[PDB]
Design a protein around this ligand. Structure first.
Ligand SMILES: CCCCCCCCCCCCCCCCCC(=O)OC[C@H](CO[C@@H]1O[C@H](CO[C@H]2O[C@H](CO)[C@H](O)[C@H](O)[C@H]2O)[C@H](O)[C@H](O)[C@H]1O)OC(=O)CCCCCCCCCCCCCCCCC
Ligand code: CLA
Ligand code: CLA
Ligand code: CLA
Ligand code: CLA
Ligand code: CLA
Ligand SMILES: CCCCCCCCCCCCCCCCCC(=O)OC[C@H](CO[C@@H]1O[C@H](CO)[C@H](O)[C@H](O)[C@H]1O)OC(=O)CCCCCCCCCCCCCCCCC
Ligand SMILES: CC1=C(/C=C/C(C)=C/C=C/C(C)=C/C=C/C=C(C)/C=C/C=C(C)/C=C/C2=C(C)CCCC2(C)C)C(C)(C)CCC1
Ligand SMILES: CC1=C(/C=C/C(C)=C/C=C/C(C)=C/C=C/C=C(C)/C=C/C=C(C)/C=C/C2=C(C)CCCC2(C)C)C(C)(C)CCC1
Ligand SMILES: CC1=C(/C=C/C(C)=C/C=C/C(C)=C/C=C/C=C(C)/C=C/C=C(C)/C=C/C2=C(C)CCCC2(C)C)C(C)(C)CCC1
Ligand SMILES: CCCCCCCCCCCCO[C@@H]1O[C@H](CO)[C@@H](O[C@H]2O[C@H](CO)[C@@H](O)[C@H](O)[C@H]2O)[C@H](O)[C@H]1O
Ligand SMILES: CCCCCCCCCCCCO[C@@H]1O[C@H](CO)[C@@H](O[C@H]2O[C@H](CO)[C@@H](O)[C@H](O)[C@H]2O)[C@H](O)[C@H]1O
Ligand SMILES: [Ca+2]
Ligand SMILES: [Cl-]
Ligand SMILES: [Cl-]
Ligand SMILES: [Fe+2]
Lengths: 78, 450, 37, 39, 341, 35, 60, 334, 32
């Protein structure tokens, strides 16, 4: 009835699994936390911070209109 | 008692069915649960007191328990203004402490007390099939229900009064002195149609009728309690009903479903037992308030509000009901049965009176109409007030909306529970709740249909 | 607001009403402690 | 705990569910604070 | 033993997660799709394509996040990361909505991989492949809605966005611009989906209420064994019950289950045909006879004409914010509205 | 008995769980961002 | 007014003690002879604390 | 032996081709009444002033409708929640102008379907069956009561009931979205999960059974002839089906118990339709779906739109255009 | 602010109280 792997209930009730995952799951959690809280996610994905939806020279939506040269368009949009 | 499937035949997800024939543990379940109800009453009241801003209207503040206490006449004055915060706190504390007592008693009977009460006492021990004992328990509990209704009567007549929104001089806590004992009025409320303009018992519009109904209910429940202590079920009742614990449960489920629907409609339509000073305006109230607000505003600008036709040809502000009554125009024509203490002074025998609309409108009626039209029971699930196309700046859903939605849903699911337990009670008493017996399958002996 | 001499326990009151919900959770925990038999 | 070298599975489920409801409560708190709260 | 047969042995081993030959298409592509969705709704904005916040990073919730469709200026450009728009710039690729064709194309190939997995496991187990044939319904809906509909339109912009409220927008868009409720192909889809839900409910309840007493517990679930040869419920009693209640009943279990397949799959295929029609604006928008009558006679009103007015209002009030690339300036006086609203 | 630790099922479980917990920590950090 | 806060804090601390203790004592058939007078004394102490809180409320 | 006992035996007879029963004594007259009046009104009823603004809407086939556009139009907004039977009208033509046939059809239909549910219990009792098919049928009943009774009660007018027609149904849905944002209501979201999942599970179950049928025929004849009505043996291999589906996803995602699987099939769309019926029944009291309009603001306080804001623009369009001559005042409060 | 600290502490105490009762009854083998 079992494909051959260790059953999940035997794994998550073992001391070794919790010794390892008591560090690995909080480290992944705080790594995602530091991805957001250091502001790195904003520069990585190009998502505006709450103060860069509009600039001093642009009060309108920065809707892309060029077919190809979108790097220059977004830089201009700032 | 069995606490597993091999010894009961009931799984964990149906565990409380393991108690059907264990009367002591059943009593402890029932009493711990009552603990829970009184616990929510007390703790929710203390929460509502802690979050209450008393100079702000209760209905702005997400309160459904303090309006109930305020309608009884505690902690409020004229126009439902909060005199003292202490009666609400007292009601909360007493429920919370008592709930501790009820919880300790349920745990006892549930975990330590005798699992069956029949070998211990004949008065408390019951068999579900013992029709005399079942009606005895009905009878004790009916005398107590009648005593509760008479306690409401005593609060209204002898211990400070109830809030009357219809009181002259403005709505106030007043002592009821001449309750309607006339059985023609009291039971003609039961005979009235459940439709527009009639409203069955939802249309009770005065505190004298309410308090007189509770004198009669108290009398009826006390008399029915003695009846059922002293008597046994008759032959037609014995041959008509299923006599089992699940059957009696399902009868109570159908009863609870009916009262849940009645409560949702009551709080949605009735402004007497649910005064608009505490619960906010009804939907009909708010629509009539908007029509009145713009009647007053355009009359101040010099519009002839009676001779003004709208775009359709009907009167823009005033028009005729289907029976001819002079009513407000636009879509609120639907709500021309609405009655409220701010509006009834402008009504004549034929409906809305032109003379009173011209030279009898007071500033407080304008203020109340503006407040009620802007506190209409329209709101989003995340409590954004007004119409759903509005933007996020008004944190409001009416207590009438919350109470009505809750009790409608509760009432529906308790009808579902009635069908489930009635059907199962019938199948279990008839012996095929566990499935069709293969040897004596009834269809295999029936003739073919065609 | 609460009466003033009770105002030190305003946070506890703020978590009081959801205790019945935990009761519905608690039975499942107890069934988990016995193996859902 | 009780089991030798074995944490009981119901304890693991209790802790995991408490953490799951905690992060869901944090998300519902964030609906009313900071970004996306309309204030 | 050649390397192909050894690899076929490894891919088709019995393990917790079956891989197969189809998994080589299924498992990366699906992981590209779902992760690409989960990345976008967590982090990626639609500010430069739509003028909208669509990520958890911007403050949107689960109902309002989306992997939104690309900017309309790209047309039907596939928007490769290396393509002539992003030119290998990952950040620019995210900003121009390249995650939408990333998720839609990896999803397409993942759905192909899943159907191939259904075929492969059906062959290895030894059963007929009707699960894959049933799964053609969802593939027809995905291909018509997410691929063929924007391909008939101006750009990928008018494709549905991979989000909850974005899908809701697409739904209301097809109402007000296409009168998609009036389309008989959609009405057949509604009939199929509601009928499949009816069949699911009625079949489950009928089986659970005509069960044979094969055990002693009130728990009836343990009176069944998977290796038993006999039916666990009475077909005869169920047939008599529905014949006397409803008038007709199933007498053939095989036809019952084929019908349970047939109804929602046919509904999905018919609604897909209608969506292919909407791709070219080939709408069931109007009844021209009722329009000519209403144009010549201003007392004639039906519910159809009322719905036409509803669509007119939604188009005029929604278009400037929904199509921000068009720069629709509609002044307040041109917006259709009734009295007092 | 003597089960393998690393399997295809292991890689399957971690391929999803590891960025799941990363993203959940990210969204938890997002809950405290002010306007 | 600080002694009323001490009385109410004592009431909630002993209430937490009783929340932990009462179902454990009721679900312990092998420690019942020890724990039943402890339950009696806890009920009496809790009731006395509630009455003291009421009296000090009307004293403050 | 008595005449009444003979009538009781005929009414409750399992030998009747259509089971009557005591619930049937109510269902048959009511459903026949509502069916007759519906057919006659759908073919030939004159236009109905639904909005109470003397703007009569033509609903019947003879007045220029087709099958799609035809409807039995709801009763007048001037009537509201008032009881309007035939005998309270001064003439039949007045009753027709004010939408009386809607009240007649709806009231009889709703009684008829509640008695249909009771009759389902009743026949299950007379056949020795388990009784809960009627519990499953309570979900379409709850939805029908929500749109024909509960939403008019909450809004204070039968004029707000779903019209008895196809395009009238669409009008009801669109105006409902305009006024309540039902798409953003988590209970409709459960309804949609109910019907989408119910169709999914219908297809999976049907496909798994048809995939695993025991070979009993040739490929000339239809496979359905491999089943005999009343046969004792099972016609498909549940172990093969389980061995397929537990490799399609994984082993413990697959039902090995047919009773557990059939329960799940029954329960999922019934629960979903219960939830969406309560969504419409609670939106009757204007507890509407989620409002996230201007939920996101930039650091200055300028609105950053989301898809909810675009959806709100669509909702505005519907709202400012619906019942376009009915409103005299700035707010649609009911 | 310190209000939300106390709220969470009171909530965490109440949350641990029930599983504490279950855990002491299971650890000592009470009448579970
Ligand atoms: C077994 C039972 C079989 C019995 C069947 C008989 C039919 C029952 C259903 C009635 C049909 C209602 C239609 C119109 C309802 C209505 O006009 O309104 C509802 C009425 C209330 O009537 C209103 O009552 C009001 C009374 O208020 C008046 O008086 C008040 C006094 O404060 C205020 O002043 C107020 O302003 C003033 O207008 C007005 O008269 C309104 O015009 C009037 O419409 O409720 C009532 O009478 C009673 C409550 C009605 C039913 C409750 C809901 C039932 C739903 C079940 C759904 C089940 C689903 C399960 C599915 C499976
Ligand atoms: C209102 C809720 C409620 C109530 C009052 C009960 C009550 C009861 N259940 Mg049910 N039950 C419920 C909900 C409820 N149940 C739910 C939701 C489920 C589904 C998970 C079940 C599933 C279920 C099963 C499967 C079984 C019961 C059984 C029982 C009975 C014996 C309990 C037992 O042995 O516990 C022993 C448990 C413990 C000793 C653990 C500790 C429990 C205590 C009460 C904790 C109280 C904490 C509280 C904060 C302390 C306050 C103290 C004081 C300050 C007031 C008891 C009468 C059993 C039965 O039928 O008996 C024959 C049984 O087999 N129940
Ligand atoms: C009759 C029940 C009832 C009603 C009408 C209200 C109404 C209200 N409460 Mg109260 N409350 C209740 C019970 C009730 N509550 C209970 C039982 C608790 C303890 C858990 C609380 C605890 C509580 C707190 C702590 C607070 C409120 C607040 C509020 C207000 C805002 C509610 C809100 O935003 O909800 C949001 C809406 C939801 C969460 C929707 C829930 C949907 C439910 C789960 C659907 C259930 C359907 C069905 C029954 C499930 C069956 C499934 C099965 C049959 C298939 C409002 C006046 C707030 C307020 O303003 O107070 C000042 C507040 O802070 N309440
Ligand atoms: C509906 C509730 C209810 C019912 C029917 C019972 C029934 C019973 N209990 Mg239980 N009990 C309850 C609640 C209930 N109890 C609560 C809440 C507690 C906690 C305080 C207890 C604690 C308890 C213990 C510790 C014991 C019992 C025992 C008994 C049995 C003997 C009763 C007796 O001696 O009466 C005769 C006693 C009297 C007539 C005097 C009491 C009269 C009451 C208490 C005064 C007025 C009632 C109340 C204050 C009015 C307001 C109530 C409010 C909710 C409206 C009997 C089966 C005994 C047992 O198990 O026997 C084996 C036992 O040892 N009970
Ligand atoms: C909630 C409390 C309660 C409960 C559980 C019962 C339960 C019972 N009563 Mg009792 N009764 C009560 C309160 C209660 N009664 C009160 C307060 C009184 C005093 C007025 C009486 C007076 C009383 C008498 C005089 C008799 C009973 C009898 C009975 C038994 C059979 C009842 C029956 O078949 O009804 C089913 C109802 C019918 C068969 C009547 C059909 C009429 C139609 C269906 C009414 C439909 C109305 C509709 C659904 C709702 C409209 C609401 C409103 C407008 C009317 C049963 C044990 C009988 C018995 O056996 O005596 C010992 C009996 O003769 N009761
Ligand atoms: C006071 C009313 C009442 C009472 C005493 C009972 C009593 C009983 N019911 Mg019934 N039931 C009721 C109302 C009632 N029911 C209603 C209203 C319905 C319709 C929904 C049902 C439907 C029903 C079914 C379908 C079945 C029972 C069964 C049973 C028996 C076992 C119950 C059990 O162990 O539950 C165990 C409890 C659980 C497993 C937990 C329930 C989980 C629910 C869905 C939570 C709902 C959410 C809630 C609103 C709070 C939201 C929390 C959220 C924030 C997480 C028992 C005799 C069983 C039976 O027939 O036994 C003979 C059975 O199969 N009941
Ligand atoms: C049995 C499992 C239980 C586990 C226990 C876990 C609990 C975790 C819950 C929430 C975590 C954060 C708590 C709230 C932070 C407090 C901040 C505050 O005071 O107010 C923050 C805001 C507004 O903040 C305001 O600020 C003012 C000045 O600072 C004042 O302090 C006001 O009092 C305050 O209201 O109010 C809220 O956001 C409260 C709403 C959200 C509260 C919790 C949401 C739902 C939580 C859990 C429900 C989840 C359900 C999922 C699963 C259900 C099925 C089981
Ligand atoms: C049996 C059973 C069960 C159940 C149980 C129950 C149901 C219970 C209960 C219980 C209860 C029902 C309880 C209680 C309590 C209470 C308390 C404990 C209290 C108190 C008090 C206090 C302390 C208060 C204080 C205060 C004051 C005085 C005022 C101010 C504020 C405050 C709050 C501070 C279950 C489900 C688990 C299952 C198993 C079995
Ligand atoms: C308080 C009050 C009041 C009063 C009221 C009254 C006076 C009442 C009443 C009441 C009543 C007086 C009631 C009732 C009821 C009844 C019912 C609800 C019933 C029923 C039924 C049944 C249940 C039956 C069933 C059956 C049948 C159908 C046949 C067969 C058998 C059987 C049993 C199944 C008023 C309004 C003035 C005001 C407000 C307050
Ligand atoms: C885009 C892209 C990419 C991809 C990536 C990937 C593939 C990844 C991923 C990812 C992922 C894969 C992520 C994740 C996640 C997650 C999450 C975010 C989660 C969650 C959750 C939750 C929150 C849940 C909750 C709940 C509920 C609600 C129900 C019950 C309870 C619980 C708690 C369970 C690459 C780089 C290649 C390239 C470029 C582009
Ligand atoms: C309402 C009032 C109901 C009274 C009707 C019957 C009262 C007593 C007549 O007799 C009672 O009923 C049937 C006859 O029908 C008998 O049989 C029962 O043994 C008896 O308890
Ligand atoms: C788990 C989440 C998965 C989603 C993706 C997460 C990755 C994080 C995003 C990092 C973005 C880096 O930011 C951007 O990277 C690209 C690489 O493609 C760089 O791109 C640069 O090199 C590439 C490679 O030849 C050139 O084609 C491109 O023209 C040039 O601009 C940009 O100079 C840099 O601004
Ligand atoms: Ca606080
Ligand atoms: Cl319209
Ligand atoms: Cl109006
Ligand atoms: Fe089946």
């Amino acid at each position: 009835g079992t494909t051959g792997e260790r059953p999940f209930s035997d794994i998550v009730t073992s001391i070794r699994y919790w010794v390892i995952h008591s560090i690995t799951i909080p480290m992944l959690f705080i790594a995602g936390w530091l991805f957001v809280s250091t502001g790195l996610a904003y520069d990585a994905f190009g998502t505006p911070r709450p103060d860069e939806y509009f600039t001093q020279t642009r009060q309108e939506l920065p809707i892309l209109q060029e077919r190809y040269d979108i790097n220059q368009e977004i830089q201009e949009f700032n | 008692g069995g606490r597993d499937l091999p010894s009961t035949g009931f799984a964990w997800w149906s565990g409380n069915a393991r108690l059907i024939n264990l009367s002591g543990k059943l009593l402890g379940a029932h009493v711990a649960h009552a603990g829970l109800i009184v616990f929510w009453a007390g703790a929710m009241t203390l929460f509502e007191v802690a979050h209450f801003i008393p100079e702000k209207p209760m209905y702005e503040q997400g309160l459904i328990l303090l309006p109930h206490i305020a309608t009884l006449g505690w902690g409020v004055g004229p126009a439902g203004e909060v005199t003292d915060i202490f009666p609400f706190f007292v009601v909360g504390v007493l429920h919370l402490i008592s709930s501790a007592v009820l919880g300790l008693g349920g745990i006892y009977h549930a975990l330590r007390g005798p699992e069956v009460l029949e070998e211990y006492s004949s008065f408390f021990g019951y068999d579900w099939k013992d029709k005399n004992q079942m009606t005895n328990i009905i009878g004790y509990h009916l005398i107590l229900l009648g005593c509760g209704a008479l306690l409401l009567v005593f609060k209204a007549m002898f211990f400070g009064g109830v809030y009357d929104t219809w009181a002259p001089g403005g709505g106030d806590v007043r002592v009821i002195t001449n309750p309607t004992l006339n059985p023609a009025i009291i039971f003609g409320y039961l005979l009235k149609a459940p439709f527009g303009g009639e409203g069955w018992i939802i249309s009770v519009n005065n505190m004298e009728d309410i308090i007189g109904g509770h004198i009669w209910i108290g009398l009826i429940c006390i008399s029915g309690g003695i009846w059922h202590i002293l008597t046994k079920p008759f032959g037609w009742a014995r041959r008509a009903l299923i006599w089992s614990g699940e059957a009696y449960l399902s009868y109570s489920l159908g009863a609870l479903s009916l009262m849940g629907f009645i409560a949702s409609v009551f709080v949605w339509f009735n402004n007497t037992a649910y005064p608009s000073e505490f619960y906010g305006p009804t939907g009909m109230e708010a629509s009539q308030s908007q029509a009145f607000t713009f009647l007053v505003r355009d009359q101040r600008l010099g519009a002839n509000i009676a001779s003004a036709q709208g775009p359709t040809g009907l009167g823009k502000y005033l028009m005729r009901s289907p029976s001819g009554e002079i009513i407000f125009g636009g879509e609120t024509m639907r709500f021309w049965d609405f009655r409220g203490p701010w509006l009834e002074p402008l009504r004549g025998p034929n409906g809305l009176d032109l003379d009173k609309l011209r030279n009898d409108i007071q500033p407080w009626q304008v203020r109340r109409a503006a407040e009620y039209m802007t506190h209409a029971p329209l709101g989003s699930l995340n409590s954004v007030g007004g119409v759903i196309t509005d933007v996020n700046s008004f944190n409001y859903v009416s207590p009438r909306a919350w109470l009505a939605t809750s009790h409608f849903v509760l009432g529906f699911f308790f009808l579902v529970g009635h069908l489930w337990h009635a059907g199962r009670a019938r199948a279990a008493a008839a012996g095929f709740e566990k499935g069709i017996d293969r040897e004596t399958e009834p269809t295999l002996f029936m003739p073919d249909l065609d | 607001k609460l009466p003033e001499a009770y105002q030190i326990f305003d946070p506890l009151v703020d978590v009081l009403p959801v205790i019945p919900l935990f009761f519905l959770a608690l039975a499942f925990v107890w069934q988990a402690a016995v193996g859902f038999k | 705990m009780f089991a030798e070298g074995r944490i009981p599975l119901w304890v693991v489920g209790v802790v995991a569910g408490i953490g799951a409801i905690g992060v869901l409560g944090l998300f519902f708190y964030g609906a009313y604070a900071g970004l996306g709260s309309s204030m | 033993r050649g390397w192909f047969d050894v690899l076929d042995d490894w891919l088709k081993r019995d393990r917790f997660v079956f891989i197969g030959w189809s998994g080589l298409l299924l498992f990366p592509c699906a992981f590209m799709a779902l992760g690409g969705w989960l990345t976008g709704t967590t982090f990626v904005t639609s500010w430069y394509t739509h003028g909208l916040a669509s990520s958890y990073l911007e403050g949107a919730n689960f109902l309002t996040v989306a992997v939104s469709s690309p900017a309309d200026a790209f047309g039907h450009s596939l928007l490769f990361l290396w393509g002539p728009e992003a030119q290998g710039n990952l950040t620019r690729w995210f900003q121009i909505g390249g995650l939408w064709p990333f998720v839609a194309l990896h999803g397409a190939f993942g759905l192909i991989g899943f159907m191939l997995r259904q075929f492969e496991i059906s062959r290895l187990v030894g059963i007929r492949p009707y699960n894959a044939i049933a799964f053609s319904g969802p593939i027809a809906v995905f291909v018509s809605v997410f691929l063929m509909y924007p391909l008939g339109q101006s750009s990928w912009f008018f494709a549905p966005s991979f989000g909850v409220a974005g899908i809701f927008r697409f739904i209301l868009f097809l109402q007000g611009f296409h009168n998609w409720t009036l389309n008989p192909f959609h009405m057949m889809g509604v009939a199929g989906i509601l009928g499949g839900a009816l069949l699911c409910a009625i079949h489950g309840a009928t089986v659970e209420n005509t069960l044979f007493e094969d055990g002693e517990d009130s728990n009836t679930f343990r009176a069944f064994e998977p290796t038993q040869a006999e039916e666990t419920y009475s077909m005869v009693t169920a047939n008599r019950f529905w014949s006397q209640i409803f008038g007709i009943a199933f007498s053939n279990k095989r036809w019952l289950h084929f019908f349970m397949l047939f109804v929602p799959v046919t509904g999905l295929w018919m609604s897909s045909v209608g969506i292919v029609g909407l791709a070219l604006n080939l709408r069931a928008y109007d009844f021209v006879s009722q329009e000519l009558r209403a144009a010549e006679d201003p007392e004639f009103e039906t519910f159809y004409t009322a719905n036409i007015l509803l669509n007119e209002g939604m188009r005029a009030w929604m278009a400037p914010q929904d199509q921000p690339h068009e720069n629709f300036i509609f002044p307040e006086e041109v917006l259709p509205r009734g009295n007092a609203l | 008995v003597t089960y393998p630790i690393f399997t295809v099922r292991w890689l399957a479980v971690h391929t999803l769980a590891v960025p799941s917990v990363f993203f959940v920590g990210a969204i938890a950090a997002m809950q405290f961002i002010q306007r | 007014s600080i002694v009323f806060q001490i009385a109410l804090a004592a009431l909630v601390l002993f209430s937490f003690v009783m929340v932990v203790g009462v179902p454990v004592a009721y679900a312990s058939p092998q420690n019942w002879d020890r724990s039943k007078p402890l339950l009696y004394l806890g009920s009496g102490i809790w009731a006395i604390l509630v009455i003291v809180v009421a009296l000090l409320n009307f004293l403050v | 032996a008595s005449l009444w006992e003979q009538f009781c035996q005929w009414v409750t007879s399992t030998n009747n081709r259509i089971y009557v029963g005591w619930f049937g004594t109510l269902m048959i007259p009511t459903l026949l009444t509502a069916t007759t009046c519906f057919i006659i009104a759908f073919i030939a009823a004159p236009p109905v002033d639904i909005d109470g603004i003397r703007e009569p809407v033509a609903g019947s086939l003879l007045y220029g409708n087709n099958i799609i556009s035809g409807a039995v139009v709801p009763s007048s907004n001037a009537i509201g929640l008032h009881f309007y039977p035939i005998w309270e009208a001064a003439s039949l033509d007045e009753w027709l102008y004010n939408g009386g046939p809607y009240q007649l059809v709806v009231f009889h239909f709703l009684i008829g379907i509640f008695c249909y549910m009771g009759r389902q219990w009743e026949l299950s009792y007379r056949l020795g069956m388990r009784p809960w098919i009627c519990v499953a049928y309570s979900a379409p009943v709850s939805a029908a009561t929500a749109v024909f009774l509960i939403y008019p009660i909450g809004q204070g007018s039968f004029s707000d009931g779903m019209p008895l027609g196809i395009s009238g149904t669409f009008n009801f849905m669109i105006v409902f979205q305009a006024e309540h944002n039902i798409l953003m209501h988590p209970f409709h979201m459960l309804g949609v999960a109910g019907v989408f999942g119910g169709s999914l599970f219908s297809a999976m179950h049907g496909s798994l059974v048809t995939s695993s049928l025991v070979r009993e025929t040739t490929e000339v004849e239809s496979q359905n002839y491999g089943y005999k009505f009343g046969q004792e043996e099972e016609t498909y291999n549940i172990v093969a089906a389980h061995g397929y589906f537990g490799r399609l996803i994984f082993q413990y995602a697959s039902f090995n118990n047919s009773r557990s699987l059939h329960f799940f099939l029954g329960a999922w769309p019934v629960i979903g339709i219960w939830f969406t019926a309560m969504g419409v029944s609670t939106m009757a009291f204007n507890l509407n779906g989620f409002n996230f309009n201007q939920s996101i603001l930039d650091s200055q306080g300028r609105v950053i739109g989301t898809w909810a804001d675009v959806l709100n623009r669509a909702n505005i369009g519907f709202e400012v255009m619906h019942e376009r001559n009915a409103h005299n005042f700035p707010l649609d409060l009911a | 602010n310190l209000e939300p600290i106390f709220q969470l502490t009171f909530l965490g105490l109440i949350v641990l109280a029930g599983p504490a009762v279950v855990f002491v009854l299971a650890f000592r083998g009470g009448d579970l």
